[PDB]
Amino acid sequence: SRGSSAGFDRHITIFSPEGRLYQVEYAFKAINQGGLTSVAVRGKDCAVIVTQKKVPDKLLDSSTVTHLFKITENIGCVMTGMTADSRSQVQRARYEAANWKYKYGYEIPVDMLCKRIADISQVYTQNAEMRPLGCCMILIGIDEEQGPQVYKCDPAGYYCGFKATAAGVKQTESTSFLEKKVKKKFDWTFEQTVETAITCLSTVLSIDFKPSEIEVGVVTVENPKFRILTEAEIDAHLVALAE
Amino acid sequence: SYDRAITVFSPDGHLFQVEYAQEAVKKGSTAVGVRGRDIVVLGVEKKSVAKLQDERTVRKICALDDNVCMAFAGLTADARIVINRARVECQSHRLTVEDPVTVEYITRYIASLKQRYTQSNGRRPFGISALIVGFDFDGTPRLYQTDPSGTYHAWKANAIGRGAKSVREFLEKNYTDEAIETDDLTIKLVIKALLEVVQSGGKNIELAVMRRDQSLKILNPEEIEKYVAEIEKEKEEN
Amino acid sequence: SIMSYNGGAVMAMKGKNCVAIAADRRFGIQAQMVTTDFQKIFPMGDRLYIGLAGLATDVQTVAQRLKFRLNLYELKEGRQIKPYTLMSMVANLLYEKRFGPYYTEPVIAGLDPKTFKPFICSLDLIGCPMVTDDFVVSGTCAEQMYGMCESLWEPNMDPDHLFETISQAMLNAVDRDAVSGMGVIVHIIEKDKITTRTLKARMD
Amino acid sequence: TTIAGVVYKDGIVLGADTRATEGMVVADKNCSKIHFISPNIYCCGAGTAADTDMTTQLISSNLELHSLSTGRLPRVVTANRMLKQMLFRYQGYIGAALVLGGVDVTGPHLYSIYPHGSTDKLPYVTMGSGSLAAMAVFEDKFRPDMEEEEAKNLVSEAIAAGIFNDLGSGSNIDLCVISKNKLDFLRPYTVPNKKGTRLGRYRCEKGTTAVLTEKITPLE
Amino acid sequence: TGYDLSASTFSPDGRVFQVEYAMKAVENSSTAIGIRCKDGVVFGVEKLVLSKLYEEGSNKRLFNVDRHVGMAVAGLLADARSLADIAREEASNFRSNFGYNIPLKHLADRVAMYVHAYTLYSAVRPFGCSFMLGSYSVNDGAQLYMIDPSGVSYGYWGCAIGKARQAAKTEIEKLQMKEMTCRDIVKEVAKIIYIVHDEVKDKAFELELSWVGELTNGRHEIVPKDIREEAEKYAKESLK
Amino acid sequence: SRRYDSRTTIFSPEGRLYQVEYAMEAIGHAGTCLGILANDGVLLAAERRNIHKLLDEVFFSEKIYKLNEDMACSVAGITSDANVLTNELRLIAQRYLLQYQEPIPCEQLVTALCDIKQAYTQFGGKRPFGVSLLYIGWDKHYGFQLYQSDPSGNYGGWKATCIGNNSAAAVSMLKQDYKEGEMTLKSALALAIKVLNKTMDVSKLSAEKVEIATLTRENGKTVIRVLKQKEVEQLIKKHEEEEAKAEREK
Amino acid sequence: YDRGVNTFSPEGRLFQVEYAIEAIKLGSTAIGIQTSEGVCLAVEKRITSPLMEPSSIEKIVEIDAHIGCAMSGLIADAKTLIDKARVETQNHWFTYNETMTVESVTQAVSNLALQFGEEDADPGAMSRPFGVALLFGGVDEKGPQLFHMDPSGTFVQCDARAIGSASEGAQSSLQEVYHKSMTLKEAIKSSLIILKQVMEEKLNATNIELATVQPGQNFHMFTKEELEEVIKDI
Amino acid sequence: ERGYSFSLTTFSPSGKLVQIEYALAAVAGGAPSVGIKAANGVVLATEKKQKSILYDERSVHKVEPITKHIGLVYSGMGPDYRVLVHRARKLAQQYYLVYQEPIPTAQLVQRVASVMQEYTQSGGVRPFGVSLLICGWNEGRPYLFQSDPSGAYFAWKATAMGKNYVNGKTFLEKRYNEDLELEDAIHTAILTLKESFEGQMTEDNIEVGICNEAGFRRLTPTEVKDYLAAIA
């Protein structure tokens, strides 16, 4: 029905009449194209990323489709959107973190890593000859003098520090759940933080997920290396929240 | 890094960019060149005299060496850069040969430059047609005309720019062997050729003449005025 | 020995608030003198002179390149050069050729554009900043000039005594040196004027 | 040509001489051999003074950019690693031997850096031509976790020994103390050497010297 | 237009239609299946016989990219050859830089990153080929990663790429391939590939089958001929 | 890239060049610049448009810059293009000074700028510098001399010329009221005030709306003086007085 | 614009090369005949005005002492290829102490032909195909030879070929009047009469350029007196 | 990576860079910011309206310093602001390395303007979608500069970018004095910010930097809310 287009304003990332970048804002729904929701929260001394594990077919090795990636020992991350884009961004983040480690003598702070990744995403947005990597990354870590930290980049590149957020099809619903939870309760311990993290996914998506249907990563100030929960811990947290 | 093919073959093998360069040349100022038996004369219409203007900087007739000069028709800035490049080529030839430059060789390498710009990536050809006057070693007058398409041909007399076709068709009928014997007749022929183009006749016109290796000089305004008076005298008696 | 290939001697000390900078005028090959009117003190500002010593070609090239970049900066910025900024810029210029160093040891002298506080500094072939309140000297006459200055210089000098001291310093440092001398040019930068003088030195 | 550094109970104390000499004669008695880098990092340079100054300036600019981008205080470790990699890229052609002292989030740190790029973290470090005298003084009178005044006196004695037993150091001592809380940079810490006045003052007036030409160009 | 002309632009929704057309170009090609078992990984690829004048083993869709890694491909076969060359170049680089054969996981990750790298710029186009890599290790076991033209690599107990991929997957689900024996799985692969092959759609056809695993001493190889006729006979019997 | 290129560095079917035409039109609606020649100097009159009271206006001049020791410039159009052009001109002028130990002739520098502008129009695929340049200066060979250049790369030498709105009216006023060879600095200044008042009749002559510059040769030294706000007020008062006198005599 | 320089047609050929061939038929008429006693080249000058000097209007160029070339089309674009061919022939002579064979010269010219693009090689390269058809007449160890160089790069060895504005029809008539045992005099007479018949204007010594290569003599271009001598009998 | 060599920004038939106009429209649609000058310093103020309180508004910063004597704020896109401030930091550090003196604010703004012009006239790149308010102190003087996405710059005593920017400019003009103090400058800036905040400003939602002879320094929420209380 007369599907007209305004030249190349809607075709490559150039300034639209409404002061917008159409191919940059397409990336926001390109995040939705993945069909997966990832929500991350931080406690007073812990940060937990909980992500549902999709199993479209048993015929693939579901033990090798884990989407949680360890950028460093103490930094874990999860991404939404194109999985190939997610792998590319994970590789780039690992490269930048290692380069910072060698060039500056200490582990990269999570805020600086997010800033560098956001600058690279802005490199894509600025240039009009590359796909602007429609994938969103959320990373966690434990920082001295500041505590547990969770950061989230984006294809647009506008990142921010946060207690908790989500990326995916139902990131807005997870945002609403986070609003109600922060307005209800403030003081969070480790077990309360993990229970709220599970409750976010459960309330938002309403799946009653099986233990194998999620992948969860945590960073705590007892062994700041990023560690992934296995089936035992997943079932333990599931039954703890259920009771 | 800019390598977009600008000059490409349109249907029927017509170089539309070359046609547009020719259009720019035609819309440009009027210049003529005659190759007399002893001298070579260039005449440029100084259209839009626009008083309070230093015409020295806009002079479209520029000498390349002591025996070579050119007058352009088309884009002034492309003309200036081509004149600079022709100064470079003439000086390089003088260095590598320690002999006086050759008018035909200069015109040939300018044509090669134009053809390289037609064949190059990310470049457009030089929208100027050039009349190159000069003298060889033996004092033989030489007149060549090159076009943005890159083709250069020697002419006894021709014109470029606005009204070029009308002027050249007038010259081909008004050109006789005995009419260019002396400098006076050559100057009168060029002046009467340009009179049909310039409204002022004497003040919106500039004339340059080169003798057989005799330090070419631009014709004086008083000389132009008196020679227009002389051609009017010929007109009244004829 | 490359800096002594042509010879040189430049100095600069401070007055009460004025500055004196002086240099030899002999130019020539290691053996023969070519010109006795060579200029070695060049104005980098209305109240800022620079003296260069060492290889004559490097002196001229460094002076030209310094004037290049200084004029570019002052046209882009709209203020007369600050002596500290000029010294840092020339030091950076020399350091840019760490593997190709200009065999020149320059000195910079002048006044603050607004404060008129005396400023003098020295460099080397690499361009090491060397700011010394009393005096800075450079060239093949370095030892003679240092010995002269460390006894002839006093703080808080009037312009006339300053000129006398620096003139005696150059005269008595070049008369005992073979690759320098044959005329001394002296510039006295006071608060509101500059005096350029040629000393009646032995031409040989 | 005599610089030293030490870690005491609180932070780092750095010291340096001032006899900056080229060739064999003293060129300057007020060299700034203790370069500022960050409000918690200082470094003492020895060798080619121009190379040391440029190296310290580049490191200071790089850490300024890093700290201002990261919102954190600069680290001694990042400065040391950058110095190592840059000097190693130039294979020691930068004739700079450095003593990098400072106090960071993880605590006070002192590093000895060689022009070829080798570095080492040592509680007490000496460098320069007169390094051996200061090193001997340290080996003789160094203790772990010394007080502020004890560290200052030890560094002063080490610099004095280097000054009095080396022919390229003297005329002043420079001290800089960095701690978890306060940074002090006292350049004329102690002047162990004075100059006697000229017993017979000899001065001249106008007319004592002969001048050929005068040219007055008044300015405004 | 505008949303399907290059891989450097999103759809108004944020889709990559060039990659979707690459998926179409790999789907319409001949079938290629890979089954990993506890003691081996097998590949059975379907060869279209344009004419009987061709040789058996011509235009192989099975490449041997490392000393122990195979590669079963579908889609543009020239593109598949180029990707196999890139994979063996990466394996050579890893062997030179680390002194041992590259693991299949990192090999597949690097190749998928390379494939995705040529799905970002308008100066290139996404690969028109999907490929499954199977390898074996003494400490890792039998491994099999399938890689999309988009650049996504996942481990598969058993995967199929091509026209009848879903039918091959569904009928082979009855097999508990994760703890099966490579020799009999070769025969079952012959079976599944014969049923999923459409004789009416493609009257002329040929099979290229291979395995890598512990029976191979951990080095990729083609099926020995005798096992080839025996598996062919089993497949003929299973056609019923 | 074929569809999505802007191909600004190609010809046109009718032989013109749309990019330079648009640049000239934009310059036409841009600020007003005027240059004039006198027997003892050359004068520049530049008009500043953005005159909000929030300006710090600390700069000596906005559209008038100093290319080198003995030559000044006035820009018309995009001020950022103007800044990059001006510092490039300063760089190359100082380059000539270094190479020859002589102040760079104005014609030399104008020719070099027109060369680079023409080349930038010729290729590169970029939109041309839509800024007109008006250069004044003094040289050993011609002394006081001023040129007007165009974004197309063409330049011309003039005794006086103006760029901006009502350019035809301004040049007509110059052709009517300029005394060639007999124009002193005072009469030239009065003519410049007349032009500034007339070629921009909307928002009639104001002190802060324009900036006035002079270039003279005193004691073999080129002096570039920017007339202060009190000076511009004096010009306005003199123009008002002379206009009133002329009207009363009329 | 829109269409690229490396774009084919729906039937599978470069329409840019088709445009180049169209420009070939827009070029000047040229004729080349190879016999057992040498090879002859001729071309119509297409004089626009009498003011134009006939000396500068020459479509026949010497590649070597034993090779002549006739160009039709973008005569400005042909001179670069001619210079390249001559420098390559002289490089071959410098390397192997022998005159370069005409066939190898033609193959190298084909190598230079159809080497262009937007972003396919070094930026300082060609953007468009050569729009000139060439006739390489020459004498070498294989006796007299004649090669039709098509701008497509499809080089041809042909006994006789007519190209340009009146390429077809005139080529058929030339073939009909051409035999396999003709002398050099018969060849030049036939080429001259065919060119005169196909002339769009009244031709004379100032309307045609003639040249020949002989097994014994070098590449010689017919001056005006010999041109009139050979044309008076026709 | 190939890199487009044709400038995306092109001259319209009227000569207006409509792409730059769209960049300025994006600037206006971005978060507003204000800057103001005093007789002895400059004050920059802006608002950071995140989403619901789940964002840690403390973690991220909007006011950024370049040197000890130069700070800046932006109105527009944060991704462009990060790279632009990072490049400006590099330029200031390089100038300090070369000349061993602090960057003058005017020269730094000139370098940023040159960078923006290179971006606008180069190929394969999008114009920056930010407007910078730059405060600086050098030679005992204050400086405040407006820099637009078009690449130009101005020295403005007061400015307001973003939504309702023209009304903010008029309000500043009405409430601007020539010889005001830093306290009056802060009062005026906070008054303008609350007049154009649209949603009950908070010490967390307001971040302010001050530049004077003591350098440039960002006000922490304690003294921030102190000044908001004093101003009401």
PDB file of C-alpha atoms in Angstrom, chain C residues 19-130:
ATOM      1  CA  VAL C  19      67.938  41.289  29.881  1.00  0.00           C
ATOM      2  CA  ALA C  20      71.241  41.284  28.001  1.00  0.00           C
ATOM      3  CA  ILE C  21      71.979  38.800  25.208  1.00  0.00           C
ATOM      4  CA  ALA C  22      75.204  38.840  23.197  1.00  0.00           C
ATOM      5  CA  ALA C  23      76.866  36.731  20.525  1.00  0.00           C
ATOM      6  CA  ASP C  24      79.984  36.562  18.396  1.00  0.00           C
ATOM      7  CA  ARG C  25      79.840  37.648  14.760  1.00  0.00           C
ATOM      8  CA  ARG C  26      82.530  35.522  13.077  1.00  0.00           C
ATOM      9  CA  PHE C  27      81.349  33.032  10.454  1.00  0.00           C
ATOM     10  CA  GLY C  28      83.619  30.711   8.519  1.00  0.00           C
ATOM     11  CA  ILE C  29      84.881  27.198   7.938  1.00  0.00           C
ATOM     12  CA  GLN C  30      86.967  25.504  10.662  1.00  0.00           C
ATOM     13  CA  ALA C  31      90.092  27.222   9.286  1.00  0.00           C
ATOM     14  CA  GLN C  32      89.246  30.458   7.453  1.00  0.00           C
ATOM     15  CA  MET C  33      86.890  33.287   8.353  1.00  0.00           C
ATOM     16  CA  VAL C  34      84.372  34.017   5.597  1.00  0.00           C
ATOM     17  CA  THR C  35      82.178  36.795   7.011  1.00  0.00           C
ATOM     18  CA  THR C  36      82.565  38.961  10.112  1.00  0.00           C
ATOM     19  CA  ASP C  37      79.004  40.369  10.011  1.00  0.00           C
ATOM     20  CA  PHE C  38      77.046  37.149  10.572  1.00  0.00           C
ATOM     21  CA  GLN C  39      73.835  37.466  12.577  1.00  0.00           C
ATOM     22  CA  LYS C  40      73.341  34.960  15.390  1.00  0.00           C
ATOM     23  CA  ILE C  41      70.713  36.716  17.548  1.00  0.00           C
ATOM     24  CA  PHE C  42      67.236  36.671  16.042  1.00  0.00           C
ATOM     25  CA  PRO C  43      63.987  38.279  17.269  1.00  0.00           C
ATOM     26  CA  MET C  44      61.287  35.781  18.180  1.00  0.00           C
ATOM     27  CA  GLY C  45      59.250  38.670  19.583  1.00  0.00           C
ATOM     28  CA  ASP C  46      59.207  42.371  20.307  1.00  0.00           C
ATOM     29  CA  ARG C  47      60.774  41.637  23.717  1.00  0.00           C
ATOM     30  CA  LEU C  48      62.326  38.235  23.022  1.00  0.00           C
ATOM     31  CA  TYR C  49      65.622  37.390  21.307  1.00  0.00           C
ATOM     32  CA  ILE C  50      67.188  33.987  20.681  1.00  0.00           C
ATOM     33  CA  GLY C  51      70.874  33.178  20.193  1.00  0.00           C
ATOM     34  CA  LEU C  52      72.099  30.018  18.484  1.00  0.00           C
ATOM     35  CA  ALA C  53      75.545  28.417  18.495  1.00  0.00           C
ATOM     36  CA  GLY C  54      77.023  25.412  16.727  1.00  0.00           C
ATOM     37  CA  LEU C  55      76.899  24.281  13.106  1.00  0.00           C
ATOM     38  CA  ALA C  56      76.047  27.343  11.023  1.00  0.00           C
ATOM     39  CA  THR C  57      73.726  25.464   8.661  1.00  0.00           C
ATOM     40  CA  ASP C  58      71.847  23.973  11.606  1.00  0.00           C
ATOM     41  CA  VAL C  59      71.693  27.438  13.191  1.00  0.00           C
ATOM     42  CA  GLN C  60      70.083  28.902  10.075  1.00  0.00           C
ATOM     43  CA  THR C  61      67.698  25.981   9.502  1.00  0.00           C
ATOM     44  CA  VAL C  62      66.586  25.857  13.147  1.00  0.00           C
ATOM     45  CA  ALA C  63      66.051  29.624  13.163  1.00  0.00           C
ATOM     46  CA  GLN C  64      63.973  29.450   9.974  1.00  0.00           C
ATOM     47  CA  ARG C  65      61.836  26.534  11.184  1.00  0.00           C
ATOM     48  CA  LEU C  66      61.371  28.152  14.601  1.00  0.00           C
ATOM     49  CA  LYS C  67      60.266  31.420  13.000  1.00  0.00           C
ATOM     50  CA  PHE C  68      57.904  29.397  10.789  1.00  0.00           C
ATOM     51  CA  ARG C  69      56.143  27.651  13.658  1.00  0.00           C
ATOM     52  CA  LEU C  70      56.277  30.706  15.944  1.00  0.00           C
ATOM     53  CA  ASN C  71      54.629  32.948  13.350  1.00  0.00           C
ATOM     54  CA  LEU C  72      52.010  30.279  12.679  1.00  0.00           C
ATOM     55  CA  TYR C  73      51.247  30.006  16.402  1.00  0.00           C
ATOM     56  CA  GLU C  74      51.075  33.759  16.979  1.00  0.00           C
ATOM     57  CA  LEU C  75      48.811  34.271  13.963  1.00  0.00           C
ATOM     58  CA  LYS C  76      46.524  31.458  15.139  1.00  0.00           C
ATOM     59  CA  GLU C  77      46.482  32.650  18.759  1.00  0.00           C
ATOM     60  CA  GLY C  78      46.671  36.454  18.586  1.00  0.00           C
ATOM     61  CA  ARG C  79      49.148  37.181  21.399  1.00  0.00           C
ATOM     62  CA  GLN C  80      52.878  37.813  21.458  1.00  0.00           C
ATOM     63  CA  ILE C  81      54.840  34.700  22.393  1.00  0.00           C
ATOM     64  CA  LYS C  82      55.431  33.976  26.065  1.00  0.00           C
ATOM     65  CA  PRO C  83      59.146  33.242  26.619  1.00  0.00           C
ATOM     66  CA  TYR C  84      58.444  29.974  28.451  1.00  0.00           C
ATOM     67  CA  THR C  85      56.204  28.812  25.602  1.00  0.00           C
ATOM     68  CA  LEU C  86      58.846  29.741  23.019  1.00  0.00           C
ATOM     69  CA  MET C  87      61.524  27.857  24.952  1.00  0.00           C
ATOM     70  CA  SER C  88      59.326  24.773  25.293  1.00  0.00           C
ATOM     71  CA  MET C  89      58.388  24.898  21.603  1.00  0.00           C
ATOM     72  CA  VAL C  90      62.000  25.148  20.416  1.00  0.00           C
ATOM     73  CA  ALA C  91      62.996  22.388  22.852  1.00  0.00           C
ATOM     74  CA  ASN C  92      60.283  20.200  21.326  1.00  0.00           C
ATOM     75  CA  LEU C  93      61.529  21.136  17.847  1.00  0.00           C
ATOM     76  CA  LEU C  94      65.051  19.963  18.687  1.00  0.00           C
ATOM     77  CA  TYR C  95      63.734  16.789  20.325  1.00  0.00           C
ATOM     78  CA  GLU C  96      61.748  15.910  17.184  1.00  0.00           C
ATOM     79  CA  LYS C  97      65.136  15.118  15.589  1.00  0.00           C
ATOM     80  CA  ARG C  98      66.403  12.858  18.388  1.00  0.00           C
ATOM     81  CA  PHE C  99      67.995  10.551  15.803  1.00  0.00           C
ATOM     82  CA  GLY C 100      68.893  13.446  13.483  1.00  0.00           C
ATOM     83  CA  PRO C 101      69.880  16.125  15.970  1.00  0.00           C
ATOM     84  CA  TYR C 102      70.693  19.669  14.926  1.00  0.00           C
ATOM     85  CA  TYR C 103      74.210  20.351  16.182  1.00  0.00           C
ATOM     86  CA  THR C 104      73.089  23.563  17.897  1.00  0.00           C
ATOM     87  CA  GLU C 105      72.945  24.679  21.532  1.00  0.00           C
ATOM     88  CA  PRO C 106      70.607  27.697  21.648  1.00  0.00           C
ATOM     89  CA  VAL C 107      69.719  30.216  24.347  1.00  0.00           C
ATOM     90  CA  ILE C 108      66.537  32.276  24.696  1.00  0.00           C
ATOM     91  CA  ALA C 109      66.360  35.662  26.425  1.00  0.00           C
ATOM     92  CA  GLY C 110      63.693  38.311  26.847  1.00  0.00           C
ATOM     93  CA  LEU C 111      60.928  39.712  29.027  1.00  0.00           C
ATOM     94  CA  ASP C 112      57.446  38.679  30.064  1.00  0.00           C
ATOM     95  CA  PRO C 113      54.947  40.369  27.696  1.00  0.00           C
ATOM     96  CA  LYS C 114      52.851  41.651  30.619  1.00  0.00           C
ATOM     97  CA  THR C 115      55.093  41.317  33.693  1.00  0.00           C
ATOM     98  CA  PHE C 116      58.429  42.253  32.035  1.00  0.00           C
ATOM     99  CA  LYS C 117      60.139  39.797  34.377  1.00  0.00           C
ATOM    100  CA  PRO C 118      63.503  38.786  32.859  1.00  0.00           C
ATOM    101  CA  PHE C 119      63.660  35.282  31.401  1.00  0.00           C
ATOM    102  CA  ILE C 120      66.714  33.409  30.120  1.00  0.00           C
ATOM    103  CA  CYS C 121      67.150  29.728  29.286  1.00  0.00           C
ATOM    104  CA  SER C 122      69.424  27.351  27.394  1.00  0.00           C
ATOM    105  CA  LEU C 123      69.120  24.113  25.433  1.00  0.00           C
ATOM    106  CA  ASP C 124      71.390  21.515  23.833  1.00  0.00           C
ATOM    107  CA  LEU C 125      71.549  19.557  20.578  1.00  0.00           C
ATOM    108  CA  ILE C 126      68.555  17.483  21.744  1.00  0.00           C
ATOM    109  CA  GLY C 127      66.802  20.460  23.317  1.00  0.00           C
ATOM    110  CA  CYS C 128      67.130  19.979  27.065  1.00  0.00           C
ATOM    111  CA  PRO C 129      65.420  22.843  28.940  1.00  0.00           C
ATOM    112  CA  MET C 130      67.870  24.651  31.223  1.00  0.00           C
TER     113      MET C 130
END
